[PDB]
Nucleic acid binder design. Structure first.
Ligand SMILES: [K+]
Length: 228
RNA sequence: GGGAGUGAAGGAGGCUUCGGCCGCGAAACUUCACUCCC
């Protein structure tokens, strides 16, 4: 694909035949994140599973040791004293079904959204099609839906991430910012990798982490050894 | 070796001959995968 000079340059910096260590990679990050903003670091792993087999779906969440160095605007749809509990946990905008029409008018000033199970009827059906493209819709297996809404909200704002393999058997997640210190990123990179392994399916066949990579928003990639 | 599509992820910037072009919509761009084609 037609690349820019900025990127053609980044290519000369990494060796595609070399399997870098989690730490070597963590040091390249700075030298690759040359876009005109604080690029995000990410890890991509091709998983030894059968995406078609519902029970071999790698899906979960995990807390990162050094956050995502990113501010997360969480919205909280709720019912009862739960509202008070959400406001307490630290959500940016708390509310009830009313939020539903507010969003149907064009309000998308949030990054995340959580909700108590008892509002999901209205939230599910109504906000379903408008929130669906951005992957904003609250879900139980996503960790976005729970009565312990303050704990869920507390967690997100602390740099907790989600991860679900895609239909091709690959899984991806952000693990920090290019501004992070080399080793902080590394702690974060091992964290996510360990999260994946603790979610290896029972009937999963063969080598689980077939490959694992490190990259930034606009830079190239470097294959790493998951156990470094 | 190159041209593309599809999925997921990251993403508010990306490219430029400096004329502007593209993107902040799912959409630019980039990554890992699933295919098509030359
Ligand atoms: K990328």
């Amino acid at each position: 694909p037609k690349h820019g000079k900025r990127y053609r340059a980044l290519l000369e910096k990494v060796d595609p035949n070399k399997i870098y260590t989690i730490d070597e990679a963590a040091h390249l990050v700075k030298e690759l994140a040359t876009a005109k903003f604080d690029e995000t670091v990410e890890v991509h792993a091709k998983l030894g599973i059968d995406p078609r087999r519902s029970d071999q779906n790698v899906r979960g969440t995990v807390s990162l040791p050094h956050g995502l160095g990113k501010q997360v605007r969480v919205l909280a749809i709720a019912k009862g004293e739960k509202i008070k509990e959400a406001e307490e946990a630290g959500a940016d905008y708390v509310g009830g079904e009313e939020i539903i029409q507010k969003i149907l008018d064009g309000w998308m000033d949030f990054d995340a959204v959580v909700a108590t199970p008892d509002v999901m009827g209205a939230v599910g059906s109504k906000l379903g099609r408008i929130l669906g493209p951005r992957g904003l819709l609250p879900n139980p297996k996503a960790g976005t839906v729970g009565f312990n809404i303050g704990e869920i909200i507390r967690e997100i704002k602390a740099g907790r991430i989600e991860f679900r393999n895609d239909k091709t058997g690959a899984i991806h997640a952000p693990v920090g910012k290019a501004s992070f210190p080399p080793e902080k990123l590394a702690d974060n990179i091992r964290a996510f990798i360990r999260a994946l392994e603790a979610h290896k399916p029972e009937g999963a066949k063969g080598t689980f982490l077939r490959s694992v990579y490190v990259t930034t928003t606009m830079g190239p990639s470097v294959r790493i050894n998951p156990h470094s």
